[PDB]
Design a protein around this ligand. Structure first.
Ligand SMILES: O=C[C@@H](O)[C@@H](O)CC(=O)C(=O)O
Length: 716
């Protein structure tokens, strides 16, 4: 009815609207626009805001959309490469009192509508009101904190909403390094006993790894049904609220790390007829979890599990069923009047898949099946059955037909596929370029030849330097995309710089270095120099750093000269230091700074330090620190093997410091006249094994509790 091409025209057409009329945004870029629409349509005659050509109306910059009234439809829009100036990108309200009812947002894309600051939280879709629908939308590349889709519950007008959220595509969500990266949140703790009655169904969660809670259910009466979770880190958690129905969901973990399933807390939960495959998560992130709760819990803790059922689920090739998880002096109430019946557990990666943290007498176990090779400590309710798992018609590892029929599961088949969800006009393209997937480029010896070669390289490229040759930098060597810098086998080239940082990983960058020699003879006379650094600003794209067969010498022109220094506000999916040699360094090897707001922030997910020698380093090799009390979130995972530290950390101090690491493995490593190893084991169960280490002329391991396992610790 009304085609508009500028904000002025838009605001005129929506100043007065009647049932049936539509406002069309003409194709093109809509930059820095705050779209507001109020009106009252009709069941047969909605008020529609639509794109001229779905995929060709690009809302960008500092933009958002807020609407209120009745029977509004919003379709075909794209929000790409911007950030909302409010708290919400698409909002089903226009003020605290004016909400949308019986309205719909469909066939719409939000693509990287992320703040440049990774620590700032917003909501991408905020649902208010009653009887709203959110369907067939694509939400991709959320790089900051916050919830992608939230159902709000802060007033009566938004409770008992019966919203429907369905057929949406939730694309990859990088690990945040902090709390609050849920994909779907239904309610909040402050209104958690209130009823929402939301249905989320037929959605596809694709590597939505923001945090441990993929779906944070925080209100009563919801149905989370018939969704697909593909290699998703974290769980579907019934965090607060009762009378949740969780059925027909398929978790395709594929043996990826930290892949969890369904966590029951609180009352009258039904978790049945779900399918799980290849889930590796443990404890609060296990494939199936039933928590202990706090008697007379405050609304923000954990209600004891009562009147709940966990039945007729299929759990294949998964590792952890955790009953009573969280049990302690506070969470002292074990599950009661609940049942665990008719489940099929077929896995061989963990032959003792159950952990019981408390008395499970309050749970009636009946009719379950567990593969011959595995055992349960529960005396009743389980029958052993052979491990028979065959890929079926729809490409899914399935139990035998006779067991399926015995529990009335039906076919093992996805309730929805990747191809049936999201906007119909927007591709689902990978956004990450792999190391060495591009061209090999020669870098001749000399001054700023590496600088120039990087400036024109592309993601995936490999810069190959001349063996034994000299390289000098007088400018920053900036890495704007995944790149490899290396020499083929033979004599290491030597790299020097007159700048305070040799190489900086910029936002979007990631770096492999192999068979290089970095030396400090040309470095400037400043404190805080480093060989490799991050960008110096918040980087809302996680980076990666791989260092293999590298030699680093004479970082001593001034104090605090580090090998690698990540500034506050950056996050590394993986840092690997392999088979490398470091000598005469006044700083730390790895300086992993943090921007402390949430005390739970951490700056690296996976750290591997293996095959190295560290000699005459005044500061530590690495401090890995996560504060706060979140037992539930990830921790860094750290592996330290086959290294030698000679005169490290003596410039009282420590040579390595690990604090709030959820998984720490140290082995085959010798300290020689170094500061001691320092540990701090946080509440929960941080897994910590230290085997075959020699502490020659080194003080005793510094720890807070004896809570770790240790074997073969020699003190010379
Ligand atoms: O804030 C801490 C959170 O871990 C918790 O309250 C909510 C949650 O996600 C959990 O316990 O796992």
């Amino acid at each position: 009815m009304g085609l508009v091409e500028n904000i002025k025209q838009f605001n005129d057409a929506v100043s007065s609207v009647k049932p049936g009329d539509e406002i069309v945004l003409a194709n093109g870029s809509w930059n820095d626009v705050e779209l507001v629409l109020k009106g009252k349509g009709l069941p047969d005659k909605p008020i529609t805001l639509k794109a001229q050509t779905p995929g060709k109306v690009i809302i960008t910059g500092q933009s958002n959309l807020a609407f209120s009234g009745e029977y509004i439809v919003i379709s075909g829009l794209v929000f790409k490469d911007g950030a909302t100036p409010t708290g919400e990108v698409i909002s089903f309200r226009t003020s605290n009192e004016d909400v949308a009812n019986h309205s719909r947002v469909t066939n719409t894309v939000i693509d990287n509508f992320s703040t440049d600051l990774r620590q700032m939280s917003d909501l991408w879709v905020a649902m208010y009101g009653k009887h709203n629908r959110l369907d067939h939308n694509s939400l991709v590349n959320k790089r900051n904190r916050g919830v992608t889709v939230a159902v709000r519950m802060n007033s009566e007008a938004s409770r008992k909403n019966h919203h429907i959220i369905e057929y949406n595509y939730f694309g990859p969500r990088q690990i945040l390094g902090a709390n609050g990266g849920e994909t779907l949140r239904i309610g909040t703790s402050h209104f958690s006993r209130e009823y929402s009655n939301t249905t989320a169904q037929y959605n596809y969660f694709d590597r939505t790894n923001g945090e441990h809670e993929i779906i944070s259910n925080k209100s009563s009466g919801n149905s989370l049904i018939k969704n697909v979770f593909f290699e998703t880190q974290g769980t579907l958690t019934m965090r607060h609220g009762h009378f949740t129905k969780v059925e027909g969901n398929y978790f395709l973990g594929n043996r990826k790390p930290n892949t969890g399933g369904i966590r029951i807390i609180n009352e009258s939960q039904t978790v049945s007829n779900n399918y799980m495959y290849g889930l590796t998560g443990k404890r609060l992130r296990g494939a199936l979890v039933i928590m202990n709760g706090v008697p007379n819990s405050p609304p923000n803790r954990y209600d004891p599990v009562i009147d709940s059922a966990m039945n007729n689920n299929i759990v294949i090739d998964s590792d952890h069923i955790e009953l009573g998880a969280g049990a302690d002096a506070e969470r002292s109430a074990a599950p009661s009047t609940s049942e665990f019946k008719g489940n099929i557990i077929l896995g061989k990666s963990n032959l003792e898949p159950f952990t019981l943290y408390d008395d499970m007498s309050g749970i009636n176990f009946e009719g379950n099946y567990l593969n011959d090779e595995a055992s349960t400590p529960i005396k009743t309710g389980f029958a052993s059955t052979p491990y028979s798992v065959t890929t079926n018609q729809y490409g899914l590892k399935s139990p035998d037909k006779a067991l399926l029929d015995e529990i009335g599961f039906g076919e093992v088949k996805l309730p929805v596929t990747k191809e049936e969800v999201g906007a119909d006009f927007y591709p689902k393209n990978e956004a990450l370029v792999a190391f060495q997937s591009g061209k090999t480029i020669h870098v001749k010896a000399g001054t700023d030849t590496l600088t120039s070669a990087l400036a024109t390289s592309q993601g995936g490229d490999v810069l190959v330097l001349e063996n034994g040759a000299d390289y000098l930098l007088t400018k920053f060597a900036e890495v704007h995309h995944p790149v490899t810098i290396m020499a083929k086998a033979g004599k290491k080239p030597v790299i020097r710089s007159q700048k305070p940082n040799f190489i900086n990983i910029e936002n979007g960058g990631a770096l492999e270095v192999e068979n290089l020699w970095f030396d400090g003879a040309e470095s400037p006379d400043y404190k805080g120099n480093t060989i490799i650094g991050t960008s110096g600003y918040s980087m809302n794209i996680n980076y990666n750093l791989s260092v293999r067969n590298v030699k680093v010498t004479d970082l001593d022109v001034n104090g605090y000269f580090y090998f690698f220094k990540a500034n506050a506000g950056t996050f590394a999916d993986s840092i690997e230091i392999i088979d490398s040699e470091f000598s005469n360094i006044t700083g730390a090897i790895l300086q992993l700074n943090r921007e402390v707001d949430d005390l739970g922030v951490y700056s690296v997910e996976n750290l591997v330090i293996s095959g190295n020698t560290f000699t005459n380093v005044k500061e530590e090799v690495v401090t890995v620190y996560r504060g706060g009390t979140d037992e539930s979130t990830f921790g860094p995972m750290v592996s330290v093997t086959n290294n030698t530290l000679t005169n490290v950390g003596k410039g009282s101090g420590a040579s390595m410091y690990f604090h709030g690491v959820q998984k720490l493995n140290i082995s085959e490593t010798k300290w020689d006249n170094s500061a001691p190893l320092e540990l701090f084991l946080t509440n929960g169960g941080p897994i910590t094994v230290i085997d075959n280490v020699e502490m020659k002329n080194t003080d005793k391991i510094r720890a807070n509790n004896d809570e770790y396992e240790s074997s073969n610790v020699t003190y010379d």
